Design an enzyme around this catalytic site. Structure first.
Site, PDB file in Angstrom:
ATOM      1  N   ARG A 156      38.919 -29.076 -52.295  1.00  0.00           N
ATOM      2  CA  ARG A 156      40.137 -28.746 -51.563  1.00  0.00           C
ATOM      3  C   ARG A 156      40.134 -27.286 -51.114  1.00  0.00           C
ATOM      4  O   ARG A 156      40.718 -26.943 -50.087  1.00  0.00           O
ATOM      5  CB  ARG A 156      41.364 -29.029 -52.430  1.00  0.00           C
TER       6      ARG A 156
ATOM      7  N   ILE B 211      38.053 -36.149 -55.790  1.00  0.00           N
ATOM      8  CA  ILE B 211      38.119 -35.227 -56.917  1.00  0.00           C
ATOM      9  C   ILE B 211      38.531 -33.832 -56.474  1.00  0.00           C
ATOM     10  O   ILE B 211      38.497 -33.507 -55.286  1.00  0.00           O
ATOM     11  CB  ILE B 211      36.767 -35.116 -57.645  1.00  0.00           C
ATOM     12  N   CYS B 212      38.902 -33.007 -57.444  1.00  0.00           N
ATOM     13  CA  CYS B 212      39.299 -31.633 -57.174  1.00  0.00           C
ATOM     14  C   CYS B 212      38.496 -30.684 -58.056  1.00  0.00           C
ATOM     15  O   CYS B 212      38.843 -30.459 -59.217  1.00  0.00           O
ATOM     16  CB  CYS B 212      40.797 -31.450 -57.430  1.00  0.00           C
ATOM     17  N   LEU B 213      37.417 -30.136 -57.509  1.00  0.00           N
ATOM     18  CA  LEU B 213      36.572 -29.223 -58.266  1.00  0.00           C
ATOM     19  C   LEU B 213      35.875 -28.217 -57.351  1.00  0.00           C
ATOM     20  O   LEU B 213      34.814 -28.498 -56.797  1.00  0.00           O
ATOM     21  CB  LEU B 213      35.530 -30.014 -59.060  1.00  0.00           C
TER      22      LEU B 213
END
EC number: 2.3.2.23
Length: 215
Positions: free
Chosen positions: A93, A87-89
């Site tokens: 990242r 995921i990207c939250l």
């Protein structure tokens, strides 16, 4: 453990009586290293309606402890599930705040699931595919989550359906029965085959079934 107490305190909040609709179950020996936070929610959208298991990995570090999260109902979203579950939250990242607790990452997924953001995601293939056929992916998305909402025991490759009350008995029988054939006919054709996703007036197996039904 000592360091484990850090994460334990966060789970205590959710454990404080069935409230907040939150879930936190750590799957590890005395040395809790792998955490698993889930969230139960009703339907009303192809992105939400069942259970979600987010595989969390909490190490034993105080300075900059970015909680890892992946898999989670293998949801097919530009943010979640890019190649092998990711995921990207914020803390994924490039986090811009060490205060973002784990609860924020989990709660963020809920709102993120019901919030299409194909502007600048991580998966280009998904964004491009969704941009064109959004209605085709919408239905498929709800189905995947509806089937991958939960799973009992371990698995070898893939165990979908065939667990709860089976709807293949008198329903499939009632069709051939009233038609003219007798129960003995359906049973003979049902037992051998044993279909589940049968259609009322749009199934190939049916034609083959009735074929024998008349003998």
């Amino acid at each position: 453990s000592s360091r484990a107490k850090r994460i334990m305190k966060e789970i205590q909040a959710v454990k404080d009586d069935p409230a907040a609709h939150i879930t936190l179950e750590f799957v590890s020996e005395s040395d809790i290293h792998h955490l698993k936070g889930t969230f139960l929610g009703p339907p009303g959208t192809p992105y939400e309606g069942g259970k979600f298991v987010v595989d969390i990995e909490v190490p034993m570090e105080y300075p900059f402890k970015p909680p890892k999260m992946q898999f989670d109902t293998k949801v097919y979203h530009p943010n979640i599930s890019s190649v092998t579950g990711a995921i990207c939250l914020d803390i994924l990242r490039n986090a811009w705040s060490p205060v973002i607790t784990l609860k924020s990452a989990l709660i963020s997924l809920q709102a993120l699931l019901q919030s299409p953001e194909p502007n600048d995601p991580q998966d280009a293939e998904v964004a491009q595919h969704y941009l064109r056929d959004r209605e085709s992916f919408n239905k498929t998305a709800a189905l995947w989550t509806r089937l991958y909402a939960s799973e009992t025991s371990n698995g070898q490759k893939g165990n979908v359906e065939e667990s709860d009350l089976y709807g293949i008995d008198h329903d499939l029988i009632d069709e051939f029965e009233s038609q003219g054939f007798e129960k003995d006919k359906i049973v003979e054709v049902l037992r051998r085959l044993g279909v589940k996703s049968l259609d009322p007036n749009d199934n190939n197996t049916a034609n083959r079934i009735i074929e024998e039904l008349l003998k």
